[PDB]
């Protein structure tokens, strides 16, 4: 019989791991940029939701490269395509804003 006695302990451990990753990954926000996505199953299509990573077409339209996007911590989804212009435009605008806001230090 499983009992979740460690719920508080598990939360504390997760917070400690997040803080440790923040110390290791201080300059970056720990996570990677992800696109806006529309769910299937019309019961949920009306509601937008996050996604895994941007398509190669979105990255190309954003003005950068897949490898450069990965090094800039941008999620990439090679197996995902674009079928609606609204979502593509939203992703392009999000990528443009992120590129404008980010500042990259030299490799030195």
């Amino acid at each position: 019989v499983k009992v979740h006695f460690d719920q508080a302990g598990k939360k504390v451990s997760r917070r400690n791991a997040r803080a440790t990753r923040a110390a290791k990954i201080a300059p970056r926000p720990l996570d990677l940029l992800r696109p806006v996505v529309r769910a299937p199953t019309v019961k949920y299509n009306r509601k937008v939701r996050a996604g895994r990573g941007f398509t190669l077409a979105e990255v190309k339209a954003a003005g950068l490269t897949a490898a450069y996007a990965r090094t800039i911590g941008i999620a990439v989804d090679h197996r995902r395509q674009n079928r609606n212009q609204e979502i593509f435009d939203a992703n392009v605008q999000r990528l443009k804003e992120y590129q404008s806001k980010i500042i990259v230090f030299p490799r030195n």
Binding site: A23, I25, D31, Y98, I103
Partner: protein
Amino acid sequence: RKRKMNRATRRNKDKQRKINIQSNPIIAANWDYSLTMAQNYKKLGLRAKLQTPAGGKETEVVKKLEELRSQSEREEEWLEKLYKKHGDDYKKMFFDKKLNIYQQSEGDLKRRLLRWKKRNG
């Protein structure tokens, strides 16, 4: 077995919270270990998560803006020889089998010769 063992102390509970931000000395200067990760990020004026956080809730950046080849000896001698032989006539250098052993194209020839001249006038 524990009975036999009772019949290697290690302290780490306190050391598991005071994590040093070794990833960036610049951040460490303005970092505050007394505050949370999100609180520290807000104090430093840097985003903590690119996605919407779950549930309820710029001098530092100014100090981050400041942070933001030649030919080989044998290659240099070969390029000098080609320049002496033909000067700027890349078309003639292309057919110069004596020196253009690799059959360099008209573009690579000029691309290398311009850099050669940069250090030779």
